[PDB]
Design a protein around this nucleic acid. Structure first.
Ligand SMILES: [Mg+2]
Ligand SMILES: [Zn+2]
Ligand SMILES: [Zn+2]
Lengths: 49, 263, 392, 43, 147, 114, 133, 65, 56, 30, 181
RNA sequence: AGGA
């Protein structure tokens, strides 16, 4: 029945928890809040594969 | 014939269906309780484990051992160990059972209530025999072993009652009904449209006269006539589950009469 | 947490078996405890002086009427509240056998078997009568509910004269942690110890009577009439068309916005208001269609647990789901789920759960209810820490 | 054990809420109550 | 707890002769309060029961699957075919007296889970004991015999 | 761990009597018997049988708390009639009734073929 | 220690408003035109239909605890088929020479409207209610 | 994990009836509802005992010492 | 805040709570084990002298 | 009719095949 | 599932047909037609959230495919197959659920959070966690004595091995007011 | 890492 997907480290069964992140290389436009000189921003979180 | 009357409807090794009439509900119920709780039986109570190479734990097995029904016919001539005079136990107060099993076979080896052996001297009384009702004659399946799986243990079956542990329960379910037509108005039927259609009739509806709508409510009416069914587990025969129940309750009331007398 | 002076009260020890602290149920509320696995702390004084502080200032009976809200902070709950209604109806009569037991059960009982309300044919006592054995003399109470007269046709309100119930069914309003309450009057008139005795005395007779009468609740109590279900479906059906009509009216530029509101803001206000008016009518249909024998209605009537909305949601219609006040929004471009067409302002697209819990929710209805559900859990988890700091 | 091998963590506009986009990908009910509510997703 | 966020601890334990019984000699293993149900609107718990009661009698795995064509009215028809009253209620009798309960009890099987949290692992009491070294104040936690 | 012994349910304690009769102060010719290591089986049975006695004016019983197998039985009788006697009589009549029940079941069983 | 009111009434209406075992009755005195009656009756014990002739009596007697049997030999002050015991709670002055008394028999209420029984009906816990036919 | 001796609810021996039940299904081919009933398991408390059992013991036996 | 306004304290106990319809409002059911642990310092006075000698 | 439309119960035979191949920790492994 | 207008014989219908179902179940009895078999045949596709934006899904196939040309009251109120645009169909809606929720019987009949609670408690329920329990040395382990498979089950449990390794017992339950305990 |  034991499915696997875990590691045995110095005896203990360790699970690597999936860590959520925002996708890279993505064009996103956001309205910048009423007290700001900048009204709107275009962002790109560019990083190499 | 005298006071409260019985009329047996169906009898067997395991079950007694009957009608009890000219009795108070209090008395039928008191007897109902007594049968479940206070009739003495013999059951495995101490288990010394010599070797256990099984997949089951010592105490898991020990527990199952207590639940194995034992012949308690002559339980009346066995003393309650607590009342007995020996340092722990003896033949006067206990039945010694031995269970030795081993996986000789390549196939799974089964350990049954039949595999029990009496090592104590019985004094020729009917007691401690594992109850086998099983068709193939094996009784309860205690354990399973593969190969070098050995089971060696000794049992001390002692006299007891269900109040102390439900293992000394001489009866299984006790069926109990009165007034199948709600003539006494002892229940208020939950319904959506009609309580007559929604609530099924019982067997006992036949054994009693239907109320006939065009009649006033019998407030005068009290509850007598009780359709019961005592199911034995095998420790004691069904008749005795009833008889002993009557006797135990009698002896119980007797104690009160005597207690007043000592005072 | 200990957000009250009543979250820490002084009690009498009773040494008992089994590993749990045992508490009287009426003292549950001040602590805010329940038995779903709660744990409580016990502190033992060491000085004769220290004990005097506990017994004389912070003991449970003294804590009955709280200054927090100038009303009693303890009352009759659950079984005892549920049973107290059942026991005090005009229909409820008790035979001698049980009356004598119920009487013996009151520890401070005068030893005087009261005269039955009905002497021949058959001596029968009423619930009202034998409950009054717990009500001490000199206790005068009067309450007029809607439609109550001195002849109380509906067995409405309350009239207790010399600690004897004259008329009305006893429930939340009477024997609960209420302002004019039987508890509030007793404390103020008889004392804190006399009232604390009354607490037990009610729950000994009531619980005993309820033990023997019994009370249950099942799926049968959630189902409403075959024709009342037809009537509920058609109530939603007509309300759905009332929406479609406003939808087509706004699509044809004929809609005229309320001053200081978008044309859309105005539209949604109507749609939401229609679907909510609908969820209620559908509910109010069932709460009427469920007989006095409905175990749920019975719990609602006593004030022990449940309210209209619970019946409505279980029996009739769950209703419109909301997130941030607005209906379920277009998380996907111009739609709520990929199972829908674009620019769908319909009840079904924006989170209206047409179905009852009894009937079951559709995959969409389920997910939208889930979104709406998760919102509650977020604030519940947030509020918990935010609220704590305010207290501090 | 099964549900621990399908767990998701979200560290740090309105993350805790159940989004339309979570349909078919993340469980609408399996989430802790408390500081982790809606931040710890289950696949 | 059941599989419906319907958690609780034990209050008391009763033997069979105190427990309320069906005319059929059946007694509950567990007694839960009516009060849980209305405020919680955990309808599926009631259906779990009705469906499981049919399943136990019929000897067929009860399909309590989510989006299906199963109805309480359907399950009710099957239970009525088995002799019990359609909505699961059963006339029960008081265990102490033997007298019928005026109320019929919603009685049938329900899958209940034994949870990690047990009283004897929780219970703790101290009355003087180990002290910190720095603060010379009582130590932390039940294990350490803390205050 | 805090669980009592199972035999405490039925086995009398150290210097503990089955019956303990205390007189009822509140009412004349009334008494209170506390039955130790006893329960509903015998409580409700005695209560019900005393109800059948005409000279018994009051009869009730209570198991004050379930953790303990004991019950208080209150008996009030007409002046001159002793409540202890009332208990003795209803006690006796119960046995006499059971004697008939046993005899009648034994005759009915001895008539069966199974 | 004696009777307090005697008359015979005719039931106009019988009412069980969600009440399985009890009904509120509406009657009027065949003798006095001024006299009317409202009363809750255990209809399971003694049932009542409209247009029944019922002798309704009051009486302050026939205190302390209550004794059940021996009544075989005891003089049962009932020549009536249904008897109740309750308390007077309100004394309504319904104008002129007219008066109305309210009786509660453990929840089972009663309102009697008349005139003459001024030197009769009192604010007493002692108030029996006897009914025949 | 290994057949329960005696049904929790009523306490009727259920220990003997396992192999017999498993056989009324393989060899006799019968449906679960009839098999139980043949074995005299009337009340649903008794029926659920066998009908819902998961004889894990067999899996445990598959390991060596 | 942690060592002065608050403190870990002796003569304190804690367990799971459960309700009782047979307890009085102002009472608290204490497990035997918890009573057997927690202690009250009673000064030997002529009133208590004999009781205390037996408890001892 | 080896090319007839699929029913409601049929989707389960597909779900069976999904876990038959992918298992339950498909994600962690791959 | 993929839905194609591409059906000479009538309407817009699901690529997968009753023949593939039998072809899969032929392999199910063998324990040569895998999940990969449907994937490479192009009857089923993998749709991430971004792609999902441009598609249109049917919940049920049969119920949401051929249009109209009486109705049971006890069943829930459902919508329709109005669209002729359906690019895809939902395998089974109950698949939106994760491991824990999938053990909840009739979750479509519970208030939203009552389900969120069971998907937290089942993780603290005792049962058989693995059959090798007796052979492993773990700091703390709880095994239920006599586990039972649930009487009421989810079609989803099959793949979760729940009926093989349970977390509880089927208790005979009364919902009653008894001693008030 | 969990419990109210
Ligand atoms: Mg809680
Ligand atoms: Zn001996
Ligand atoms: Zn059973």
């Amino acid at each position: 029945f034991d499915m696997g997907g875990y590691f045995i480290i110095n005896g203990s069964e360790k699970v690597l928890i999936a860590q959520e992140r925002s996708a890279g290389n993505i064009v996103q436009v956001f309205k910048k809040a009423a007290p700001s000189p900048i009204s709107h921003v275009a962002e790109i979180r560019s990083a190499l594969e | 014939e005298e006071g409260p009357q019985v009329k047996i409807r169906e009898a067997s090794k395991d079950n007694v269906d009957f009608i009890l009439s000219n009795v108070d509900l209090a008395m039928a119920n008191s007897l109902r309780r007594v049968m479940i709780a206070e009739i003495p039986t013999l059951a495995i109570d101490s288990v010394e484990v010599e070797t256990n190479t099984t997949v089951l734990a010592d105490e898991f097995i020990a527990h199952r051992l207590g639940l194995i029904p034992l012949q308690s016919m002559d339980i009346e001539q066995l003393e309650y160990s607590r009342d007995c005079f020996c340092e722990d136990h003896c033949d006067k107060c206990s039945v010694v059972l031995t269970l030795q099993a081993f996986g000789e076979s390549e196939s799974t080896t089964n350990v049954y209530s039949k595999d029990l052996v009496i090592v104590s001297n019985l004094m020729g009384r009917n007691i401690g025999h594992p109850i086998i009702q099983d068709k193939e004659g094996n009784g309860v399946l205690i354990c399973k072993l593969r190969k070098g799986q050995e089971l060696k243990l000794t049992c001390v079956a002692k006299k007891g009652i269900a109040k102390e542990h439900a293992k000394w329960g001489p009866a299984a379910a006790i069926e109990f009904e009165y007034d199948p037509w709600n003539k006494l108005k002892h229940t208020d039927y939950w319904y959506e449209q009609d309580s007559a259609k929604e609530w099924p009739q019982s067997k006992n509806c036949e054994y009693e006269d239907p109320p006939n709508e065009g009649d006033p409510f019998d407030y005068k009416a009290q509850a007598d006539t009780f359709y019961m069914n005592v199911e034995s587990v095998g420790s004691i025969p069904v008749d005795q589950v009833v008889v002993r129940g009557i006797d135990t309750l009698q002896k119980k009331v007797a104690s009160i009469l005597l207690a007043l007398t000592q005072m | 947490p200990s957000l009250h002076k009543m979250s820490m009260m002084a009690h009498r020890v009773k040494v008992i078996p089994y590993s749990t602290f045992r508490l009287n149920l009426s003292v549950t509320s001040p602590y805010n405890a329940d038995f779903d696995g709660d744990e409580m702390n016990l502190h033992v004084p060491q000085s004769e002086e220290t004990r005097a502080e506990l017994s004389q200032l912070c003991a449970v009976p003294l804590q009955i009427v709280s200054p927090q809200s100038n009303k009693p902070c303890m009352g009759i709950v659950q079984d005892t509240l549920c049973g107290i209604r059942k026991l005090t109806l005009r229909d409820t009569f008790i035979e001698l056998d049980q009356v004598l037991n119920m009487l013996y059960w009151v520890p401070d009982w005068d030893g005087v078997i009261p005269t039955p309300a009905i002497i021949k044919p058959k001596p029968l006592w009423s619930g009202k009568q034998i409950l009054s054995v717990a009500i001490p003399n000199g206790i005068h109470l009067q309450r007029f509910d809607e439609g109550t007269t001195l002849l109380s046709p509906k067995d409405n309100g309350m009239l207790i004269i010399d600690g004897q119930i004259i008329f009305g069914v006893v429930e939340k309003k009477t024997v609960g942690s209420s302002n004019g309450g039987l508890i509030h009057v007793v404390t103020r008139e008889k004392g804190p110890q006399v009232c604390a005795k009354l607490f037990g005395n009610i729950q000994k007779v009531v619980n005993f009577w309820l033990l023997h009468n019994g009370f249950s609740t099942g799926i049968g109590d959630t189902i409403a009439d075959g024709p009342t279900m037809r009537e509920i479906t058609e109530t939603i059906a007509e309300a759905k068309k009332k929406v479609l009509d406003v939808t087509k009216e706004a699509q044809a530029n004929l809609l005229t916005a309320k001053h200081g509101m978008t044309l859309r803001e105005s539209f949604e206000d109507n749609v939401v208001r229609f679907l909510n008016e609908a969820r209620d009518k559908a509910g109010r249909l069932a709460e009427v269609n469920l007989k006095d024998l409905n175990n749920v209605k019975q719990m609602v009537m006593a004030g022990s647990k449940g309210s209209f909305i619970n019946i409505a949601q279980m029996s009739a219609c769950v209703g419109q789901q909301s997130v941030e006040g607005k209906r379920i929004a277009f998380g996907f471009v111009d739609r709520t789920l990929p199972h829908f067409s674009k620019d769908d302002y319909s009840p079904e697209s924006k989170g209206f759960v047409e179905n009852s819990y009894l009937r079951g929710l559709t995959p969409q209805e389920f997910f939208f209810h889930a979104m709406g559900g998760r919102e509650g859990l977020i604030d519940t988890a947030v509020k918990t820490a935010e609220t704590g700091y305010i207290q501090r | 054990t099964l549900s621990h091998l399908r767990r998701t963590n979200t560290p740090i506009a309105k993350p805790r809420q159940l989004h339309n986009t979570h349909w078919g990908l993340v469980c609408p009910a399996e989430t802790p109550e408390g500081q982790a509510c809606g931040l710890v997703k289950n696949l | 707890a059941s599989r419906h966020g319907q958690k609780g601890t034990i209050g008391i334990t009763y033997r069979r002769e105190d427990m309320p019984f069906t005319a059929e000699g059946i007694v509950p293993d567990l007694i839960i309060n009516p009060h849980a149900i209305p405020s919680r609107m955990t309808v599926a718990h009631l259906i779990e029961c009705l469906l499981s009661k049919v399943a136990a009698l019929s000897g067929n795995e009860g399909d309590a699957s989510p989006f299906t064509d199963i109805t309480v009215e359907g399950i009710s028809k099957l239970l009525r075919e088995h002799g019990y009253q359609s909505r699961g209620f059963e006339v029960m009798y008081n265990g102490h007296t033997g007298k019928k309960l005026m109320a019929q009890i919603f009685f049938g099987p329900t899958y209940y889970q034994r949870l990690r949290h047990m009283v004897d692992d929780k219970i703790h009491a101290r009355a003087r004991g180990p002290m910190q070294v720095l603060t010379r104040q009582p130590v932390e936690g039940r294990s350490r015999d803390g205050g | 761990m805090n669980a009592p012994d199972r035999f405490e349910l039925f086995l009398l304690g150290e210097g503990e009597s089955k019956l303990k009769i205390d007189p009822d102060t509140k009412a004349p010719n009334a008494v209170v018997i506390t039955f130790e290591k006893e329960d509903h089986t015998l409580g409700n049975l005695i209560r019900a049988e005393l109800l059948n006695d005409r000279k018994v004016l009051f009869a009730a019983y209570k198991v004050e708390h379930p953790f303990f197998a004991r019950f208080k039985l209150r008996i009030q009788t007409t002046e001159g009639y002793d409540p202890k006697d009332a208990l003795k009589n209803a006690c006796n009549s119960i046995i006499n009734k059971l004697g008939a029940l046993k005899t009648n079941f034994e005759t009915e069983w001895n008539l069966q073929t199974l | 220690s004696n009777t307090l009111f005697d008359d015979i009434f005719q039931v106009s209406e019988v009412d069980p408003g969600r009440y399985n075992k009890v009904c509120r009755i509406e009657a009027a005195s065949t003798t006095q035109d001024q006299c009317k009656l409202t009363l809750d009756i255990n209809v399971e014990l003694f049932p009542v239909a409209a247009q029944d002739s019922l002798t309704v009596t009051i009486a302050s007697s026939l205190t302390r605890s209550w004794r059940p049997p021996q009544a075989g030999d005891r003089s049962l002050a009932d020549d009536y088929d249904y008897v109740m015991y309750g308390t007077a709670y309100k004394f309504e002055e319904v104008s002129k020479d007219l008066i109305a008394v309210y009786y509660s028999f453990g929840g089972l209420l009663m309102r009697l409207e008349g005139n003459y029984r001024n030197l009769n009906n009192l604010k007493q816990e002692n108030a029996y209610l006897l009914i025949r036919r | 994990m290994i057949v329960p001796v005696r049904c929790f609810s009523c306490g009727k021996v259920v220990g003997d009836k396992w192999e017999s039940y498993l056989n009324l299904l393989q060899e006799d081919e019968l449906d679960e509802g009839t098999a139980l009933s043949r074995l005299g398991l009337k009340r649903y408390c008794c029926r659920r005992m066998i009908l819902t059992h998961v004889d894990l013991i067999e899996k445990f036996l598959r390991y060596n010492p | 805040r942690g060592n002065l306004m608050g403190k870990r304290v002796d003569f304190s106990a804690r367990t799971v709570i459960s309700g009782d319809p047979n307890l009085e409002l102002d009472q608290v059911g204490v497990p035997k084990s918890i009573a057997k642990t927690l202690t009250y310092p009673e000064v030997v006075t002529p009133y208590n002298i004999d009781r205390l000698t037996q408890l001892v | 009719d080896e090319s007839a439309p699929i029913t409601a119960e049929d989707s389960w035979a597909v779900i069976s095949a999904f876990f038959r191949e992918k298992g339950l920790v498909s994600q962690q492994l791959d | 599932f993929i839905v194609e207008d591409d059906e000479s014989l009538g309407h817009k219908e699901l690529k997968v047909r009753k023949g593939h179902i039998a072809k899969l179940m032929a392999t199910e009895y063998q324990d040569e037609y895998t999940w990969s078999s449907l994937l490479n045949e192009g009857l089923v596709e993998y749709i991430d959230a971004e792609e999902e934006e441009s598609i249109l899904i049917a919940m049920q196939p049969e119920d949401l495919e051929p249009a109209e040309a009486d109705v049971d009251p006890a069943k829930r109120i459902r919508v329709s197959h109005h669209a002729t645009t359906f690019t895809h169909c939902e395998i089974h809606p109950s698949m939106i659920l994760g491991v824990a929720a999938s053990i909840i019987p009739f979750p479509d009949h519970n208030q939203s959070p009552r389900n969120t609670y069971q998907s937290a408690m089942g993780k603290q329920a005792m049962g058989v966690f693995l059959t090798n329990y007796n052979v492993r040395m773990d700091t703390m382990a709880n095994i239920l004595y006599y586990p039972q498979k649930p009487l009421g089950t989810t079609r989803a449990m099959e793949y979760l091995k729940f009926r093989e390794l349970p977390a509880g017992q089927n208790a005979i339950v009364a919902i009653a007011c008894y001693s008030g305990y």
